[PDB]
Design goal:
homodimer; mainly alpha; Citrate Synthase, domain 1; Cytochrome p450-Terp, domain 2; two-stranded antiparallel sheet; binds oxaloacetate ion; transferase; Krebs cycle
């Protein structure tokens, strides 16, 4: 129990216990019973959900998916195994992984019309716009299984999203440059096949560099879930209205499209580019991922920053992931798209969770009204 | 002041005062200082923003835009005057309205390529999908003024949205049926011109019914803002990341696409349709808008429900708006689109507000972790 005393006064609140981390003080019917609200910029101290998907403690600093630490999955799992784990909450036995992997492998081709629909975008349009556009359009082609309540339908569009979203991001890249779209090769991994779709020409056969593959696969594990989140709390809110799966991911994708969140990688490069386009090099808590990322960065290795890094190791992140992506040949305007591809499983897991609850109710936040109280006067 | 006492105990919280309605108890750095969070399903009792845009008291029951009651604007204003008011926070003098009205009237045509892009959707696709798809695509054609920080750019895409979104919704309708798209007539009102775009053929000239016009214009005033909201808190969250204006509206549009929120009108008709497709008529707080809406409904007047209405006036809303829209010839799958057209000014006003603040910070909600704590075992 807690007790709260407000000018009207005064109230007792249940405490809800967390299997790890901070516990919650359950607001009741806070107004009334009390005619008062909490005010909390950013929702930074408010929790509206229970989930058992990702635990983090930065101070500690821990990141686990379903209890498993990130260093272990990064080093020992795969992006697909991680998709499975996050979504259904356990690691898969050999049959379960293969059948899940099989199910995704057979849904990677888009409807030819949805392929053609890329034709309407302008001559070399930025991929981030194209991808949000195309994801909303999915409901136009896969009307088939859109019922948020029916599962099996959720299952089929969970599959469709995990399979088709890399295909879409690879096509948006091809569109952003002049290049033909390729098709899925059944003989590749999803991640390896994603890399062909992105980088393959019809002028030659494509061989994925294995070091490249493992680097990308790992990096999607590192970015698979991180919640709660701007992006995912957005998937949660839209789903709140019982929006369908696609429409909720799209909202996650739109939230992701902003520099503070999804394009932080892109901001860093932008920092870098300027310098190379101006006179140079002058003056005026550890993440478990960060450390794994520096490691894979130092191997694979930007033209150039490294000075920057060395330079202020002397005198006084998202930074490393940017360099890597660029190192693998990804142009800066694919970074946020790469982010969504990796986060997709988390977006999905949270939405599914949200659905499986005792019953969710729609999101209805408050405000502190700070305006007027007046009468209409005719326009003269 | 308030004081909160928790098992660790115990803390004092500032109170932030509202010019009307409930006041807030400002969470501080709630964890730590305390290692605890609030838990509040739906955010129902939590406020993360101050705004002075819409005040409501349902119990009372009041709805005002910028201090002005809804009955007065509905009966005496226009949808455009209401757009202006909400966004810039005051009613406009004769020059300001005309110049604002002029500015919108000259931006209603889409880029011909963005027009053509409707060609890629399937043969008679539902409008709601098409509209989310096309709104995300705006950033592809109006790269021109996308800087969330630069105003004047915000101004130009505020205009572009208010002008072009009815055009887009009218085209999505035309697409949903077989029909040619028409173009804007400079000699019409936005709302009247919207109705031509929706219902006009090239086989005859279009005359808008004035009773029809006034009915639609009023109805967008009734739906112009209502916040805070699922839909608008979603626009607020996306904007939180500094997403651009279009990407934030798109998120509002996706949140709107769900039965609890934007498609409540559509749910009612769906209730109605079933009956007409099964054996019939059997058994097992006042909104200020509601009342205005019944009034305009009874004049303009569904095949049929009215029995339903009479029938349980005997024995024991969003309902009335559905009948009207259908009465004006709108098919059920335009209802949520009609909803967005009306809400657009509110979406925009809140986003702009959010921007003009001392400085917003990104949305970072919490959770109550309720999961595991385990170690990777190889897949056998
Ligand atoms: O994963 C990242 O790069 C950061 C992130 O999503 C978050 O704070 O949610
Ligand atoms: O306006 C409506 O029809 C209901 C609504 O948006 C809300 O509760 O925010």
């Amino acid at each position: 129990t807690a007790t709260l005393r407000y000018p009207g006064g005064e109230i007792d609140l249940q405490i809800v216990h967390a299997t790890e981390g901070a516990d919650g003080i359950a607001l009741g019917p806070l107004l009334a019973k009390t005619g008062h609200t909490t005010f909390d910029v950013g929702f930074a101290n408010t929790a509206a959900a229970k989930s058992s998907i990702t635990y983090i403690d930065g101070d500690a600093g821990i990141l686990r998916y379903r209890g498993y630490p990130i260093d272990q999955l990064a080093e020992k799992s795969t992006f697909i195994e991680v998709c499975y784990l996050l979504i259904y909450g356990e690691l898969p036995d050999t049959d379960q992984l293969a059948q899940f992997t099989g199910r995704i492998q057979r849904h990677t081709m888009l409807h030819e019309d949805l392929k053609r629909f890329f034709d309407g975008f302008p001559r070399n349009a930025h991929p981030m716009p194209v991808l949000s556009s195309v994801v909303n359009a999915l409901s136009a082609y896969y009307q088939d299984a859109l019922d948020p309540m029916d599962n099996g339908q959720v299952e089929l569009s969970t599959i469709r999203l995990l399979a088709k979203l890399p295909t879409i991001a690879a096509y948006a890249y091809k569109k952003s440059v002049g290049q033909p779209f390729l098709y899925p090769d059944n003989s590749l991994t999803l991640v390896e096949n994603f890399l062909r779709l992105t980088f393959g020409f019809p002028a030659e056969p494509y061989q994925a560099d294995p070091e490249v593959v493992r680097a990308l696969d790992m990096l999607f594990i590192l970015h698979a879930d991180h919640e709660q989140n701007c992006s995912t709390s957005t998937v949660r809110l839209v789903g709140s209205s019982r929006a369908n799966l696609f429409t909720s991911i799209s909202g996650g994708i739109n939230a992701l499209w902003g520099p503070l969140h999804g394009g932080a990688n892109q901001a860093v490069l932008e920092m870098l580019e300027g310098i190379r386009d101006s006179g140079d090099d002058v003056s005026e808590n550890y993440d478990p991922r960060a450390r794994i990322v520096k490691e894979q960065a130092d191997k694979i290795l930007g033209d150039d920053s490294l000075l920057g890094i060395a330079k202020e190791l002397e005198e006084a992140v998202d930074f490393y992931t940017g360099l890597i992506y660029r190192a693998l040949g990804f142009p800066t305007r694919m970074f946020t798209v790469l982010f969504a591809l990796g986060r997709l499983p988390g977006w999905i897991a949270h939405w599914r969770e949200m659905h499986d609850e005792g019953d969710s109710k729609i999101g209805r936040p408050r405000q502190i009204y700070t305006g007027y109280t007046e009468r209409d006067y005719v326009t003269i």
